[PDB]
Design a protein around this ligand. Structure first.
Ligand SMILES: CCCCCCCCCCCCCCCCCC(=O)OC[C@H](COP(=O)([O-])OCC[N+](C)(C)C)OC(=O)CCCCCCCCCCCCCCCCC
Ligand SMILES: O=C(c1cccc(OC(F)(F)F)n1)N1CCN(Cc2c(-c3ccc(Cl)cc3)nc3ccccn23)CC1
Ligand SMILES: CC(C)CCC[C@@H](C)[C@H]1CC[C@H]2[C@@H]3CC=C4C[C@@H](OC(=O)CCC(=O)O)CC[C@]4(C)[C@H]3CC[C@]12C
Ligand SMILES: CC(C)CCC[C@@H](C)[C@H]1CC[C@H]2[C@@H]3CC=C4C[C@@H](OC(=O)CCC(=O)O)CC[C@]4(C)[C@H]3CC[C@]12C
Ligand SMILES: CC(C)CCC[C@@H](C)[C@H]1CC[C@H]2[C@@H]3CC=C4C[C@@H](OC(=O)CCC(=O)O)CC[C@]4(C)[C@H]3CC[C@]12C
Ligand SMILES: CC(C)CCC[C@@H](C)[C@H]1CC[C@H]2[C@@H]3CC=C4C[C@@H](OC(=O)CCC(=O)O)CC[C@]4(C)[C@H]3CC[C@]12C
Ligand SMILES: [K+]
Ligand SMILES: [K+]
Ligand SMILES: [K+]
Ligand SMILES: [K+]
Lengths: 255, 258
């Protein structure tokens, strides 16, 4: 069997077994607490329904209003700052879902915007990320000869890995201060943001109408998300990206 | 100025102006309808508070319970099928947020799981995507000689672009049937899923306890998300990926000549 076919089949087996391992671990850690939380909340639902004399339909009518008011609770999500924050989540593939296009036309433009945007943003982060790696490579080379010279891959992975933790820590310290979260909650938010997972369980600028009332903090969160993705993007360009073109290189080697 | 530095500065200017254009368009399409729905919902909030004799604190107490019961409403989100669906959203960077780690330990494991998982899944989709492109290149070459031969980039972009639409069309057809959405809503869901945006406004397997009661549809949903990301990932490997190594190639070209 060809090297390309062995590498591909191994990766498929690895990904599927990694999914089976993950599903097994996430079951052990989250199955029992979810069952505990459901029964606890159902007891709280029955207690408050009895306290405020509510029927099955009576609770359900109030249930729909509370759920539909959730994106409005954070404030105006669609003005210039609201739409700029949303535009980021689309092209950077974060997509928290805190604000989503409610209109048919908005949904269409969002698709066309993503089609051209996502590749443009991806190429931008890999290009700027490479310039940072080249600057780091030059600065380290100049520092090596300065003290009394060759920059290795291992030195680049070390600086790269530390730069990623530093970006998560600088962020965590700031988001725990402004969004009033714990350092761990803010660290978890920064991880999920910069890895483009963006669950939406933690979203910045969604407290005390920050998008319209706090421009200085909005300016920082836009700068942090963009600079942070460049730091992670630089590490991907250095370590991850080289394994994606691997199949094309072996196909060229075969010819 | 160097070619690498001009290309990087142009991309930064392009991305920021694309953000300003987007923010301007999303303002025009969503500002007025959001203001309309907020005022409509605030009146409905006041109406139902008056109907069921609710105070400021009374509504707020019921508000917390309704919000906390939202992930439970869809059913059991953390059994084998629920956790497998969640594991997908993490490593594929979709992350709908329909189900999120409620425990401190679950949040930690998710971070470690993502750290190794995301690069593994990304490399897997680019590797399997390349094998699909190579198979398509071979099948077209054999078909060309069959009718009476050289496969160009333009032919590959055409087949690739059609393969992406067909995946969204097959998907929308299924998701509008099982998740009872419109073809457009299911097409929008498929687009947002396969582009790894994953807002969470549309999430499959969250209707009629599908994760625990419908195994056949769960198996399809996992297969579609995984095969669909390979189809999109193949097109990226063909068109987008070549522009990422561009700066490294010019840096190598600078060293070679000098
Ligand atoms: C090959 C590339 C093709 C790109 C095509 C992209 C098309 C994207 C889809 C646009 C959807 C527009 C929906 C308009 C809804 C109008 C109805 C309505 O409520 O009107 C009342 C309201 C009040 O009227 C408007 O909102 C006025 C129309 C404003 C439209 C400005 C944005 C245009 C964006 C596309 C061009 C830029 C690129
Ligand atoms: O899964 C895919 C995929 C695979 C097939 C198709 C497809 O569809 C399409 F690309 F079209 F959206 N996406 N990814 C491709 C896009 N992103 C990559 C990405 C990262 C990143 C990556 C990994 C880590 Cl650990 C941390 C940050 N950061 C950014 C910032 C802006 C833009 C993109 N970033 C996520 C991975
Ligand atoms: C902190 C983060 C950013 C680190 C990311 C680590 C990656 C660089 C790792 C994670 C999984 C690894 C892959 C896991 C499995 C394989 C199959 C393996 O295949 C073989 O050994 C058979 C073919 C051959 O001999 O080439 C080749 C390496 C590869 C792609 C690995 C390449 C490196 C990967 C992408
Ligand atoms: C290369 C990097 C380091 C610099 C890029 C330029 C920044 C200085 C720009 C890019 C985006 C800008 C932000 C885009 C949007 C807004 C919202 C704006 O707020 C409003 O318009 C409030 C009313 C509304 O929401 O309509 C205030 C400025 C701010 C934070 C901008 C501040 C300046 C920012 C961060
Ligand atoms: C349907 C989807 C998947 C199509 C994706 C289209 C991409 C292939 C496009 C979108 C934005 C484009 C970029 C927009 C701007 C530039 C800057 C441009 O820079 C210059 O012209 C100056 C330097 C030089 O001359 O090389 C080089 C091409 C590049 C990276 C483009 C490369 C091709 C990109 C990534
Ligand atoms: C290379 C490709 C084309 C094939 C990959 C193998 C598939 C046939 C596997 C991979 C993941 C599997 C799924 C993983 C999880 C589940 C949930 C499982 O449901 C339960 O365990 C219900 C109870 C619970 O939630 O704990 C039923 C089988 C199913 C759909 C599996 C069916 C078979 C799947 C789609
Ligand atoms: K997301
Ligand atoms: K993503
Ligand atoms: K995402
Ligand atoms: K999300």
């Amino acid at each position: 069997m060809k090297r390309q076919n062995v590498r591909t089949l191994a990766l498929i087996v690895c990904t599927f077994t990694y999914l089976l391992v993950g599903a097994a671990v996430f079951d052990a850690l989250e199955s029992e607490p979810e069952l505990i939380e459901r029964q606890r909340l159902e007891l709280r639902q029955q207690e408050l329904r009895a306290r405020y004399n509510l029927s099955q339909g009576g609770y359900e009518e109030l249930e729909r209003v509370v759920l539909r008011l959730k994106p409005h609770k954070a404030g105006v999500q669609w003005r210039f700052a609201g739409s700029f924050y949303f535009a980021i989540t689309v092209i950077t593939t974060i997509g928290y879902g805190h604000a989503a296009p409610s209109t048919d036309g908005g949904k269409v433009f969002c698709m066309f915007y993503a089609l051209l945007g996502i590749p443009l943003t991806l190429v931008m982060f890999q290009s700027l990320g490479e310039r940072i790696n080249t600057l780091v490579r030059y600065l380290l080379h100049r520092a090596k000869k300065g003290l009394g010279a060759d920059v290795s891959m291992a030195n680049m992975v070390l600086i790269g890995f530390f730069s990623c933790i530093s970006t998560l820590c600088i962020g965590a310290a700031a988001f725990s201060h402004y969004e009033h979260w714990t350092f761990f909650q803010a660290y978890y938010y920064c991880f999920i943001t910069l890895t483009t997972i963006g669950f939406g369980d933690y979203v910045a600028l969604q407290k005390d109408q920050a998008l319209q009332t706090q421009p200085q903090y909005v300016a920082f969160s836009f700068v942090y998300i963009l600079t942070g993705l460049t730091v992670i993007g630089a590490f991907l360009n250095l370590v991850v990206l080289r394994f994606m073109t691997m199949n094309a290189e072996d196909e060229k080697r075969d010819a």
